[PDB]
Amino acid sequence: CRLPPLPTIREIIKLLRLQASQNFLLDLRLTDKIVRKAGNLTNAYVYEVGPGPGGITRSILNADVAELLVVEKDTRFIPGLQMLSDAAPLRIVHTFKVEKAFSKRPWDPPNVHIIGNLPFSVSTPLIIKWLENISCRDGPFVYGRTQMTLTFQKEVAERLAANTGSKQRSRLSVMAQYLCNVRHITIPAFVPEVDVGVVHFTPLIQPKIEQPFKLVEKVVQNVFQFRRKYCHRGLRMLFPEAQRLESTGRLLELADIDPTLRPRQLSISHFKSLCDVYRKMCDEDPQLFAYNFREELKR
Amino acid sequence: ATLNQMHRLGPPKRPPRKLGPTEGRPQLKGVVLCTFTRKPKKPNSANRKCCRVRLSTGREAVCFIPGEGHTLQEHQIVLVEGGRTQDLPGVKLTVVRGKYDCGHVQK
């Protein structure tokens, strides 16, 4: 399968009309390594995001994929992707709804993979949205437990794949880990001051917290708001000041969380217990879930 | 320093000399593994023949093959001495022409 040569940085500057704010991985070897780590893509349906110059696209097409749905935002790269499609008779498209994209296994992976090398300013909202999509069993995951392979900054990937007690444990860690098996598989290599890690997400058959995504997110955020204080310091804020002390004590006691534990020493089981107790409290008190302590303090 | 300080600290403790690429020996034996070419640092550019050889101490090292023409091949026995090449960063050994499988420079 002969494909056009990869554009060098000279042609890229000419194409963007700069004549002299983005980093391109133009290393086909590294793209091939990433595609390899993505798994066996033979006759698989691949959804590609952040196409850019198209090294990832070339590597994935080299992999014997059946359909490869490219989603691009910039119109200056569409000509190159069209040339790629002609060379390999690649479905290019310019909030995107992937659910209707492909022609669905019950919750093995449904032969549908997602590959993304996007700007780090856009990956984090995207991964949060897809985590919510997994929680709701919708979006790209209508077809089942679709596997994802995304490039993040090194620190962000370490936080995503961080373990309990690891210095990088944080909200992103808990949110990603209670819904997905997350594996950090790092690139120093880009033609244009940070390292890049590659992370693979596989949705879990049995999620470790069977609670609404927004509820879990609120609980985790309030827990981690004070990363250097005892967990109760950050948990007490979930309740109005009037009943703060008693409500926090009841929460901790009905759960089995030791108040001395710091936020990063909390396991997904601890978070599950906290979320269940908080769900009960919200159910028996309608106003609690919408409470915002800073909004209250505004008065 | 003061005289008392010099007396207390005694004579200088000369650090042990780091073992060269040949681990202190003027020569070693090895088995060639893979031959190839390398590009010297600019301005020098002429291709230079190197070969990965497993020394008598198990260690594998890239060794420059001097001269023009050879017959070195996989699993062939060579003798390698020290001496870094001017313009081959990393390469820090040289096959001694005229020993074992290294038939003399094929002039």
Next chain:
Amino acid sequence: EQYLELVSAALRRSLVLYMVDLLDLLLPDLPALVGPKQLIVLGNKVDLLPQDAPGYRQRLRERLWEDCARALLLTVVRDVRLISAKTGYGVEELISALQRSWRYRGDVYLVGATNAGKST
């Protein structure tokens, strides 16, 4: 069996300190022996173990953790620690951990094998 029929009745009426000989590696029978209560694993005779590589203490703690997972909730095991009664290594930290938290209230039952070093 004698322990099951004499002492387990008293124990199943609190905290259990289960001592395990690090060199020798009863664990799967703990649920019947002690019952569903708080348990802390103490790997004894650690000083006699050579330091094969850095972080061997962490590796041993991990290995004990998978062994317990094979056999138990992580009966619940709340802490795995490595101690050497002969050298007094980690005993003070164990004492501090015992006194630092609410979870460790009540009586303490020191369970283990004959050679584990319970006397020491």
Next chain:
RNA sequence: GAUUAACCCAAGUCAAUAGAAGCCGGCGUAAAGAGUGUUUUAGAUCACCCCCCAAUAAAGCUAAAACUCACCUGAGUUGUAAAAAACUCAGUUGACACAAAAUAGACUACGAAAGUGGCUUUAACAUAUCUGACACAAUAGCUAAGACCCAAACUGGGAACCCCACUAUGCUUAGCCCUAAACCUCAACAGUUAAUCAACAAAACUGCUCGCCAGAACACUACGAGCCACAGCUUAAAACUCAAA
């Protein structure tokens, strides 16, 4: 790469390795004066001639300005480049702090250092007539309880940076952590101005003592250890690389 010629040594030649070359030099800017003070054993001869300001702790107190609450009025107030967002609140007057301390201060004092600039009182600012490891150590941070006007990491809203509100936190108590461009980047003590001197910086030196440095990066890193009580600080390497830095 070949050819000519030449040079050195010569029955040798010279590629590799190893050794011989090794501390009386420096420390403001290059590595280096350790954040600060005090010992012992010692060391040196410099021992003999020889008030008060803004230290520190405690107790008490408050002039201006805030916030809140009262009336009285007004309907907008706030916000800025300009608007949004927000509040129905705003102005005068009065009451009124556990916050901070104009002016003096163009002064240069106190303290070992960090620091110390509202007032009063109490206690009080070691010492030989030398140098020299337990006690302190700004801001930040943690634990428990209080205070919370104002400011404000973070969050949210409005069109990172700007505006609005608000939290840790800045504050009191009782304990912890021990790091700063902890800097006059110039160690203590004694002495001198005799002949100037890499450059710049705070003119140059002598004596004396302690501490510290032996190319760069690896590396305020890893391993171990101590403090921890587990996410961190102190101590601190090696290998590989380079002829630089």
Next chain:
RNA sequence: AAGUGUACUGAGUGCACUUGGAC
């Protein structure tokens, strides 16, 4: 403007400090 320390966030911000910046 630059930097030191420290903490949050994902390079900025907060507090103090230095001029190894300008007036």
